[PDB]
Design an enzyme around this catalytic site. Structure first.
Site, PDB file in Angstrom:
ATOM      1  N   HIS A 179      46.174  41.070  43.557  1.00 36.55           N
ATOM      2  CA  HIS A 179      45.445  40.261  44.549  1.00 36.55           C
ATOM      3  C   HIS A 179      45.495  40.907  45.899  1.00 36.55           C
ATOM      4  CE1 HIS A 179      49.781  38.724  44.911  1.00 36.55           C
ATOM      5  NE2 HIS A 179      49.432  38.540  46.222  1.00 36.55           N
ATOM      6  N   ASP A 180      44.735  40.624  46.721  1.00 37.65           N
ATOM      7  CA  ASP A 180      44.538  41.025  48.031  1.00 37.65           C
ATOM      8  C   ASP A 180      44.887  42.755  48.295  1.00 37.65           C
ATOM      9  OD1 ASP A 180      44.394  38.686  49.300  1.00 37.65           O
ATOM     10  OD2 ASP A 180      46.272  37.948  48.362  1.00 37.65           O
ATOM     11  N   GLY A 207      50.799  43.043  45.247  1.00 37.77           N
ATOM     12  CA  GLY A 207      49.910  42.604  46.162  1.00 37.77           C
ATOM     13  C   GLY A 207      49.968  43.251  47.341  1.00 37.77           C
TER      14      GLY A 207
END
Lengths: 262, 262, 262
Positions: C125-126, C143
Site C-alpha cells: 500500500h502506498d 508500505g
C-alpha cells in the site's frame, strides 16, 4: 450439506459431502472438497482450493490462490486421511499454504482465530497456531512448529521444525529460528538471538507496569544471571506466585525441546 | 492427439496440437498449449498452466498454481521457440515456476526425474536438473544453473547463474550460492561456505565406508591441504583409480567455471 | 465500457463499469472489477485478478496468478475506496501483488512505466515506483516505499516502510534495506551498506565520463569525507551547478526521512 443462504458462484466446484455454512461465500473458480466444512459467513474470494478433511470456522476471509488442506510435502506421507482445523475470523492472504498433518506427527494441522497470515505465508504439516498472530509475507513454518498467541513473525522468516514460539513474541524477519523462543521476547537475525522483552506489545496489550517489570526480571534471570536454567527455573516459579504473567515461562519450559535461543 | 483413456476436465482448456498421454489427468481450470506433450499417468491437479514447447514425462504430479514452459524473465528473450523437458515421477508443488530456455543459453531448460520441487521453488531459463533432487520452499535458481543428482537445496536459498551444484550436496537454506559446489559437500550461509562432507546422505544412500572415507580424504586434500587445486587435481585423479566415487570430483572440476566455494 | 476491438475470453469475468481499452486482451479465468480501467493493448494472460479503483495503462503484460488492486494488509484499512495507478509497458510476472493505498498513507499506490516486476515481487500500500525499474523474484516492498528510476532490486530483498531508493541504484538481493538509499549507489547485505557507485549502469545508461566522475566525488564527499551531512550538503549543491547529475543527491536529501545507509 449447503445453506440456502450460502452463495455459490456458478463457476465454483463444490464436491458432494462438502458442508457449507450459512451466509458463506464461495467465489469463482474455487474448488471445495467432499470432506470440507466451511463455517458461517466465511468467504473464499476466488481461485481458492480447499480440500482434505478440513474444518473451517466462521467469518474467515480467504484470498485467491490460497491452498488449504492440501497434501503435505513429507516424503513419508502417503494419502492418509489427516486433518486441518482453522478457527474464526482469520484473514488468509493470497498464495498462502496450509498443509494437512501426518499420522506420525499426530495427523493434525491447527490454526486458531483472529490470526493474520500474510502473503505466501506457509504452514506445514502438524503445526499449531494460536490466536491473534501474525505471520508476515513469505514467512515459513516448518513441520511440528508451534506458535503461540499474539506472536508476530517477520516476513521472509523461517522457523525450524519442532520449534516453539512463545506468546507475545516478536520475530525480526529475514531471520532463521532454530531453538525455542520464550514468551515476551524479541528475536533477531540469521540464527535468532534474543534482543530483550517486547515491551511495546505488552504495553499495547494491557499488561500492568508490575507484570511488565516482573517479566523483565525473569528475562534477566534467564539471560543475564549466568546461572543455568536448572538453577533459575525455581526462581521464576516462585516469582510466578506473585506475578501470574510469569507462569508463562514455566509452562513453556515444560514444552521446550530444541532448547532456547542465545 | 489425446488418449481416450485420458481425463480432461470440462473446464480445462487444451489447445489443438497438444498431445496428452494415456491415463493422464487434467483438472479444472488448467491450460495446456498446442505444443505441449504430457506423458502417461501425469496429473495436473487444477489451475495449472502448461505452455511453450514443453515435454513432460509420466507419472508426474503437478499442483495448482504452477506455471510450466512459461516465457522467461530474460530481457534478450523475444518469443523464440525455446524448450522445457521434464522427466518422470516428479512432484511439482504449488506455485512452482519453470521457464523456457534462451537460444543464447542453448534454448533448453531441463529437469530430470524423481525430483521434489517445493512450493514457490523457481527454475530459470536454461537450467539443468538431475534426479532425486530436492528444492525447498522458495528456493530459487538463476539462469544457467546446474544441479546434480541427489542434491538438496534448503528453502529460501538462492543459486547464482552459471553455478554448478555437485551430486549428493546439501545446501543450507537461507543461503546464497555464488561459486561452484563440489559433490558430497555441505554448504552454508550467505555466501555459502563448505562445512564438510554430507556423511549422513552417503550413509543413507548406500556408499561403502571406504568410499565415504576416500571421499573424506579428497575433501581434506581440497580444503585442508593448503595446496592449490592445480596441485591437488592429480592427487585426486589417482585416488579415483581405486575409489570410483572420487572421479566425481574430477568431472566436476572439468565443468567448474565460477570456481569453488571457500 | 468495452472496445469492440478488445478480446474477452468467454471464461473471464468482467464486471459492469469495467472499462477496457482497444485491442486489449483478457484471458481465461480472469476477473476484472467494475471500477477497473485497462488501457489499449494491455494483456492479462489468464487467472488474473484486477479489482479496486485501478487504472492500468497500455501495452502492459500481466501474467497469471498476479493480483492487482487488491485490498491491503494494513490493519487500519477498512474498505475505503483507495487507488492503484500503473503506467505502460510494464511486465508483471506471475504471482506478483500490488495493493491499494491507505487513506492515511495518501490513498494511492503507484507504478510507473517500462518496469520489470519479477515473480512474487510485492508492492505494498502506498508505494511509489518509477520507470525502467526492476524488482526481482520475491522482492518485497513495504508500505510507503519509494523506488526511483532505473533502480534495480535484488531478489529476496526486503525494503522497509518509508524508505527511499535513489535512481540508478543497485540492491544486492538477499538484502535488508532499513534507511534511505541515495542515487547511483550499490547497496548490500542484511542491513545494506554502501559499496560505492553503480558505475556499470551509468556506463550503460549514457552518462558522460565527467558526470560519472562528478558523481564519484560526491559519493566520497558523503561517505569518505568524515564530515557530517550538514557540512557537505552545500559542497554538493555547488558541484551540482556544474554537473547536473549531482542535483539528484540534493533532491533526494530533501526527501530522506529514515536517514541514509552506512
Amino acid at each position: 450439506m449447503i445453506d440456502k443462504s450460502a452463495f455459490v458462484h456458478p463457476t465454483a466446484i463444490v464436491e458432494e459431502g462438502a458442508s457449507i455454512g450459512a451466509n458463506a461465500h464461495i467465489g469463482p473458480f474455487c474448488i471445495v472438497g467432499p470432506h470440507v466444512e466451511i463455517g458461517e459467513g466465511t468467504v473464499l474470494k476466488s481461485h481458492v482450493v480447499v480440500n482434505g478433511h478440513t474444518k473451517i470456522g466462521r467469518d474467515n476471509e480467504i484470498y485467491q490462490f490460497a491452498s488449504i488442506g492440501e497434501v503435505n510435502q513429507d516424503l513419508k506421507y502417503a494419502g492418509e486421511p489427516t486433518r486441518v482445523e482453522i478457527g474464526d475470523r482469520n484473514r488468509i492472504r493470497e498464495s498462502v499454504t496450509i498443509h494437512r498433518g501426518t499420522v506420525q506427527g499426530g495427523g493434525l494441522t491447527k490454526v486458531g482465530s483472529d490470526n493474520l497470515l500474510m502473503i505466501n505465508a506457509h504452514i506445514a504439516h502438524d503445526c499449531t497456531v494460536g490466536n491473534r498472530c501474525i505471520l508476515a509475507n513469505n514467512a515459513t513454518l516448518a513441520g511440528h512448529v508451534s506458535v503461540d498467541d499474539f506472536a508476530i513473525i517477520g516476513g521472509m522468516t523461517a522457523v525450524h521444525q519442532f520449534c516453539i514460539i512463545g506468546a507475545h513474541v516478536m520475530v525480526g524477519g529475514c531471520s532463521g529460528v532454530a531453538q525455542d523462543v520464550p514468551p515476551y521476547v524479541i528475536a533477531q537475525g540469521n540464527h535468532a538471538t534474543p534482543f530483550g522483552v517486547n515491551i511495546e506489545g505488552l504495553k499495547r496489550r494491557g499488561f500492568s507496569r508490575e507484570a511488565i517489570t516482573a517479566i523483565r526480571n525473569a528475562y534477566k534471570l534467564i539471560y543475564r544471571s549466568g546461572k543455568t536454567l536448572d538453577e533459575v527455573k525455581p526462581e521464576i516459579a516462585e516469582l510466578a506466585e506473585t506475578y501470574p504473567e510469569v507462569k508463562a515461562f514455566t509452562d513453556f519450559f515444560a514444552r521446550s525441546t530444541r532448547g532456547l535461543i542465545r
